[PDB]
Amino acid sequence: MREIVHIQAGQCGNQIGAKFWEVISDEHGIDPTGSYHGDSDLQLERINVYYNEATGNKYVPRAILVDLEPGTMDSVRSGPFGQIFRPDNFVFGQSGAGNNWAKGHYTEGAELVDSVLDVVRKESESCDCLQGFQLTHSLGGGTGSGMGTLLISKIREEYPDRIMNTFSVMPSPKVSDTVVEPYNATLSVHQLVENTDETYCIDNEALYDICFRTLKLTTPTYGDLNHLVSATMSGVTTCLRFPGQLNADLRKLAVNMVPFPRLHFFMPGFAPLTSQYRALTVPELTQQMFDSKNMMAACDPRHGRYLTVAAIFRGRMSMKEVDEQMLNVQNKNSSYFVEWIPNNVKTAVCDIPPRGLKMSATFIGNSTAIQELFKRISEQFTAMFRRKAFLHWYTGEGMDEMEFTEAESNMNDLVSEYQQYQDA
Amino acid sequence: MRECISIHVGQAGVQIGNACWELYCLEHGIQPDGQMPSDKTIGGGDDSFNTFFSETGAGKHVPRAVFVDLEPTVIDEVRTGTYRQLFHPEQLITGKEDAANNYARGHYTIGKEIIDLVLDRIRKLADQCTGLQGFLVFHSFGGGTGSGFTSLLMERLSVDYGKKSKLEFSIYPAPQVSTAVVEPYNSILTTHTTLEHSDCAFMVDNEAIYDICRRNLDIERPTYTNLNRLISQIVSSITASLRFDGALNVDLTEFQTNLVPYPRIHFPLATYAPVISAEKAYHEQLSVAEITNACFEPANQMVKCDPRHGKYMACCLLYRGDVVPKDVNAAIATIKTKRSIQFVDWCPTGFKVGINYQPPTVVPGGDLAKVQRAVCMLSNTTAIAEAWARLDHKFDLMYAKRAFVHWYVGEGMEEGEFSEAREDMAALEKDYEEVGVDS
Amino acid sequence: MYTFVVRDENSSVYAEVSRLLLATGQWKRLRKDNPRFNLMLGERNRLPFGRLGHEPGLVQLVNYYRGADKLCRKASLVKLIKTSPELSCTWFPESYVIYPTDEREVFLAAYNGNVWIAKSISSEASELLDFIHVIQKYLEKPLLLEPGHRKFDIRSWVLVDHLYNIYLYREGVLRTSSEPYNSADKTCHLTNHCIQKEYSNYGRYEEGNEMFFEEFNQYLMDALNTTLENSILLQIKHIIRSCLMCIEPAISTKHLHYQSFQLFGFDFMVDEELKVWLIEVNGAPACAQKLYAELCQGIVDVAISSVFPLASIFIKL
Amino acid sequence: MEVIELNKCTSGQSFEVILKPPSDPSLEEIQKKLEAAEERRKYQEAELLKHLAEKREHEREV
Ligand SMILES: Nc1nc2c(ncn2[C@@H]2O[C@H](COP(=O)(O)OP(=O)(O)OP(=O)(O)O)[C@@H](O)[C@H]2O)c(=O)[nH]1
Ligand SMILES: Nc1ncnc2c1ncn2[C@@H]1O[C@H](COP(=O)(O)OP(=O)(O)CP(=O)(O)O)[C@@H](O)[C@H]1O
Ligand SMILES: COc1ccc([C@H]2[C@H](CO)C(=O)N2c2cc(OC)c(OC)c(OC)c2)cc1O
Ligand SMILES: Nc1nc2c(ncn2[C@@H]2O[C@H](COP(=O)(O)OP(=O)(O)O)[C@@H](O)[C@H]2O)c(=O)[nH]1
Ligand SMILES: [Ca+2]
Numbered sequence A: 001m002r003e004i005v006h007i008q009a010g011q012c013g014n015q016i017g018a019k020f021w022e023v024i025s026d027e028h029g030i031d032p033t034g035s036y037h038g039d040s041d042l043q044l045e046r047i048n049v050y051y052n053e054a055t056g057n058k059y060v061p062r063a064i065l066v067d068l069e070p071g072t073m074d075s076v077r078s079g080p081f082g083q084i085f086r087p088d089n090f091v092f093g094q095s096g097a098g099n100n101w102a103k104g105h106y107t108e109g110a111e112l113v114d115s116v117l118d119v120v121r122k123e124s125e126s127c128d129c130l131q132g133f134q135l136t137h138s139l140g141g142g143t144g145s146g147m148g149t150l151l152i153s154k155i156r157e158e159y160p161d162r163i164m165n166t167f168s169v170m171p172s173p174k175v176s177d178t179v180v181e182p183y184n185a186t187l188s189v190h191q192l193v194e195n196t197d198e199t200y201c202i203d204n205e206a207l208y209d210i211c212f213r214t215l216k217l218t219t220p221t222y223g224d225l226n227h228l229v230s231a232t233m234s235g236v237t238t239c240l241r242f243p244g245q246l247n248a249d250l251r252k253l254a255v256n257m258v259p260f261p262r263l264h265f266f267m268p269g270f271a272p273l274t275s276q277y278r279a280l281t282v283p284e285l286t287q288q289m290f291d292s293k294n295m296m297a298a299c300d301p302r303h304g305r306y307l308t309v310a311a312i313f314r315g316r317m318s319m320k321e322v323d324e325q326m327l328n329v330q331n332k333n334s335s336y337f338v339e340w341i342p343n344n345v346k347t348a349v350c351d352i353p354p355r356g357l358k359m360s361a362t363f364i365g366n367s368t369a370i371q372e373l374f375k376r377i378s379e380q381f382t383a384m385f386r387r388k389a390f391l392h393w394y395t396g397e398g399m400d401e402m403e404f405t406e407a408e409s410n411m412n413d414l415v416s417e418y419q420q421y422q423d424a
Numbered sequence B: 001m002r003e004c005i006s007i008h009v010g011q012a013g014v015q016i017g018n019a020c021w022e023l024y025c026l027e028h029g030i031q032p033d034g035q036m037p038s039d040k041t042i043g044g045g046d047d048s049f050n051t052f053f054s055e056t057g058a059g060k061h062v063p064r065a066v067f068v069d070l071e072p073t074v075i076d077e078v079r080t081g082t083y084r085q086l087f088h089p090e091q092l093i094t095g096k097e098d099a100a101n102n103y104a105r106g107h108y109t110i111g112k113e114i115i116d117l118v119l120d121r122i123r124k125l126a127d128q129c130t131g132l133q134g135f136l137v138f139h140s141f142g143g144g145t146g147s148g149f150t151s152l153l154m155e156r157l158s159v160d161y162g163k164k165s166k167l168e169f170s171i172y173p174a175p176q177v178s179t180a181v182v183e184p185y186n187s188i189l190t191t192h193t194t195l196e197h198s199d200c201a202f203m204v205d206n207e208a209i210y211d212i213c214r215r216n217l218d219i220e221r222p223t224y225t226n227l228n229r230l231i232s233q234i235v236s237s238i239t240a241s242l243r244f245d246g247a248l249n250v251d252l253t254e255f256q257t258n259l260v261p262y263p264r265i266h267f268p269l270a271t272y273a274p275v276i277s278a279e280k281a282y283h284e285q286l287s288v289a290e291i292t293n294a295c296f297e298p299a300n301q302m303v304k305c306d307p308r309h310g311k312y313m314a315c316c317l318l319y320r321g322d323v324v325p326k327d328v329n330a331a332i333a334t335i336k337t338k339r340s341i342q343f344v345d346w347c348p349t350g351f352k353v354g355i356n357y358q359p360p361t362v363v364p365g366g367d368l369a370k371v372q373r374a375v376c377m378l379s380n381t382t383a384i385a386e387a388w389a390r391l392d393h394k395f396d397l398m399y400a401k402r403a404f405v406h407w408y409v410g411e412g413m414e415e416g417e418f419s420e421a422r423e424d425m426a427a428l429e430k431d432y433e434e435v436g437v438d439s
Numbered sequence C: 001m002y003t004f005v006v007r008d009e010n011s012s013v014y015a016e017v018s019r020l021l022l023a024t025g026q027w028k029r030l031r032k033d034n035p036r037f038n039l040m041l042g043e044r045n046r047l048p049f050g051r052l053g054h055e056p057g058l059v060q061l062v063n064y065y066r067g068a069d070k071l072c073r074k075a076s077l078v079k080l081i082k083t084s085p086e087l088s089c090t091w092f093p094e095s096y097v098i099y100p101t102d103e104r105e106v107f108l109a110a111y112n113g114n115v116w117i118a119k120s121i122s123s124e125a126s127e128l129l130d131f132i133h134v135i136q137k138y139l140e141k142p143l144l145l146e147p148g149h150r151k152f153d154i155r156s157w158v159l160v161d162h163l164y165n166i167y168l169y170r171e172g173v174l175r176t177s178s179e180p181y182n183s184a185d186k187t188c189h190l191t192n193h194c195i196q197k198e199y200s201n202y203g204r205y206e207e208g209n210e211m212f213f214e215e216f217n218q219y220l221m222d223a224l225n226t227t228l229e230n231s232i233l234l235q236i237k238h239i240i241r242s243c244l245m246c247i248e249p250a251i252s253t254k255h256l257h258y259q260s261f262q263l264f265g266f267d268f269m270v271d272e273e274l275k276v277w278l279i280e281v282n283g284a285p286a287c288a289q290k291l292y293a294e295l296c297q298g299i300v301d302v303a304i305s306s307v308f309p310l311a312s313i314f315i316k317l
Numbered sequence D: 001m002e003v004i005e006l007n008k009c010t011s012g013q014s015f016e017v018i019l020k021p022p023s024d025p026s027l028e029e030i031q032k033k034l035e036a037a038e039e040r041r042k043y044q045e046a047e048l049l050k051h052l053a054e055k056r057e058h059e060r061e062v
């Protein structure tokens, strides 16, 4: 059945995870009570990828909700589809993690992880052919970043031949909780380079700009940013939740998207940017989707080259005109694709559009311009660490300056690796 | 009478299998429930169609096929489809998880654990054979199963049946209808491993068929159904000699003998005409001489290449329908002059011809129009080395950076099997040059 | 807007076709090895034809004809006229193919006076056969230009488009040894820029050794009471037609997955009886200096933009 | 242009037409490789579980 186990950790991880289940449950006919009231069986054909069946033939998300304080979880429970979720699958502690990676990864997190892995284990064993795991979390806080990457290390240990995929939100000064965010995020990126197969870099800087100078919102809330994440997460998983010529699964996606095992951080993209009754034409989907202004990761992709790309158009449109329009923008912009990976841009079409759009296009890009992101964090990181500032919050939890130097070092390698393929 | 066992590996091999076995039933008049009214010898026989079908006491005619796929999704559709009552449940073999477009994961990792079961299921067919000839193996070059498990199966088949012929129908990979960026990798890999175990391999380039479906059936986006129903006609022409009364190409050894002098050079170029849209309102039926000239246009080959620029080693013409030899040697006579047809010096410039008077069958409702005469040409020309050159360049671009190699090594392969397989293809490209061009 | 790549960097004329192309604001150049092009300007040697015409949504055009070396390599050019029935033919010198086929045996059946020539000149067989390459009779009685008593050859440029229309460039060039003609001593026997820019006073009786068409017609009028059309160009158009119509079925790209055009350089000799002779065909010719602009533009007009349209100077044959 | 072995029958005809004339590895060797790959897989996994085990004793030291 190739089931996926979804895990959402921390504040940012549980709010975007909560929106994800809202969006795709509507796409699959499942109402807030877990009952299915849809019209096509395309909705139910591949529905066991993300849902377990119930006794009343209801549907329950294969979702585990993890936090080190309950504040967000009871709010998820009180929110829209909150009662869709398996009540045992709420795993949480009380002390919080203080926007502190060490507390999530080493002290408070370690106290809670085994109970999390018991739910993982329970959810995993029911699966006929589990493909792997999908984690939603931010990297700038403490639970989603520190505990999140701890969970990933343990899962890799228990399930080393399953696929680990994450949706990982990147801190940005423009949308910032605390100044130690670059510390937490440098530490998590080291974990993600080693222990995930595919990571989607959702940048909070990009979501803000899109929300400001495009969706024409002058002061965007987190709900505006998370609306954009809902849409990308729905689209990036369309080929997984719906049947097609493509038999897309997590392992095949990694095989075809990742030429080099460390370079597996994807820039997602979306069109049209929702926040409208004239559907976009296929040349609009194509031009917009590839515009700098439609990337969720805040790198101009004209600054580096695409190793690989995977795109889906949702709606009822000219399959051929897609191919025509794709191959156009490629051969109008062939300066930003690598000439040494034949046929590295792949396209799909799906007849089911998402709610409130007749035409949409999601884009997954493995571009070397994502080095702009890691450079950005690496600069913010060194700016503090050179004066050892704010470190006491970490050395008081056990960590040595050593562990920081290595994470700084391993991430600057990541930026070097990405740079050597920009020129080839 | 001597039996032939068909083996369908992967998605491409199974779905084309379905396309062929449906056509075989329409051609020999076998109903979806296995019954064959015209067959009067109930429960046995040594007829020509018995080479492909066995018979049960209750009168059912049962394919001598085995279907294998590392995942269940596609063979499951045979399990419930219009011909569920056709096959023995034991003939449809599916695993748990597929080979994730990875040669090394279909060969080494997942492959090693279904291989003994499949051979045991094939053995139960071999045991139903009074004098088995060998095997017809259908697969993609590009899938992980299709490339990786097949070369594992072709290895053991040489071991369990060293004295049996093995024929290949191979789907070569085309971008404008494709599924993985690493198909060039799996292509080279499986070709290197499978070579010495296959006596004759018919390569179908998916771009050729796709363009043929676009140009001649006027279909904008050809489906796999469109692609496969046309591939069936060509496979039915090639196999017709084994399932029907005839004196040309009557056993698998005759395919080696007639088309394969040099054994490494065993990839005969197929050409086929006419392809005619069934929604073509008014159509002027084409002549023997017309459909034989088509056999020399690139746009009708199963692999786009320019045979004017290599040398032929053999040519076979297989007609289906209203054809007589007078019509044929006339058309040959005229084409010999006006076209560049150059054999190798150590080979006779000539054609072996065969005519089955039954005109081609079409799937009712499908996209191909019924015709009164068709032909399939099988020419062992050296211009098919263009398709190796193409594949080998695409492999060279990626492998110079080692892109995606880690996914193979991750399964137990060594980088060396990559440069060993490419060194083999570089030889095979050179052999073709030693035979096809002059200083 | 269209896509082209460049893969013969030191091509005299296609360097300028590639430059005019950029300058129209409608053609983007790529790296050599980028396979997403509309138009190759390929390698002289080993152009990879087997990889053309396999890019979805890409119409591909190349500036060479696979198989055109049948005409240009002087070894196979002789074999072609001897072997091809369309070329019985009495405008090609008597020629034989010989190796360090071959035809040394019947090479002497005609030897009862004989003087010949060979490279890739003598009157006795030994002097040249020690080169152990084709053997032609030497034009002992060529036409002479006065004052000067000069030999010369004629370079006509011929363009064949993707449809196999044969286009003769209106402008041609005479390339004369601007020194008197003798008999034996080997300077004015080979008259071009390969025994004249180093060995041979290099531009005496005219300019650049290059007498262009308008002048030569005028000479023929006053000096012979005839014209360049009647006395010579008819036979040239006959020879151009005959060669290219001969190989057309071997090299045509009419029903092919890519398409070819190619520019050729035919070289002719005229004798004293005003009869025209074919010397050899050049698959990669360079143009005469002052004509580049008009011809390199005419290429892009009828060979390049003909296929890839945007927003005469030839004679059809 | 000659014609040889003309073969008629009830289903059709077959013949030849000339225009000019002319001038395996063992099971054990398999098992070897197939198991020298599984060992390479198991080695790579043991190195993974060893690096993970070291992470545990770092998590325990912090
Ligand atoms: N002509 C034709 N080609 C097919 C068909 N199905 C898949 N292909 C081609 O085969 C290649 C993909 O290999 P598959 O057969 O799908 O792979 P597989 O054997 O199922 O192996 P896995 O990787 O385990 O799924 C691509 O070139 C596809 O274009 C088909 O039904 N007809
Ligand atoms: N049959 C002939 N009669 C008279 N002169 C001849 C001749 N064949 C060659 N020549 C002389 O040789 C010269 C022509 O050179 P040619 O056209 O054969 O080029 P080439 O041998 O250098 C090969 P390429 O030009 O491609 O490098 C002329 O000046 C001409 O006088
Ligand atoms: C870069 O080359 C490839 C990328 C992905 C794949 C398949 C690959 C095989 O089907 C897989 O998985 N792809 C894929 C997956 C997606 O999400 C699951 C997509 O968007 C929602 C998608 O859009 C095309 C594709 C195949 C390739 O050849
Ligand atoms: N896009 C988005 N970012 C968030 C959200 N909530 C928090 N963040 C960001 O996440 C980081 C803080 O992580 P958080 O989840 O609050 O801490 P945690 O609970 O300890 O993991 C900061 O970069 C915030 O900008 C959200 O709902 N959406
Ligand atoms: Ca505590």
Ligand SMILES: [Ca+2]
Pocket: B039, B040, B041, B042, B043, B044, B045, B046, B047, B055
């Ligand atoms: Ca019977």
Ligand SMILES: [Mg+2]
Pocket: A011, A099, A141, A177
């Ligand atoms: Mg917070």
Ligand SMILES: [Mg+2]
Pocket: B010, B011, B069, B071, B074, B098
């Ligand atoms: Mg499959």
Ligand SMILES: [Mg+2]
Pocket: C153, C192, C267
């Ligand atoms: Mg010259």
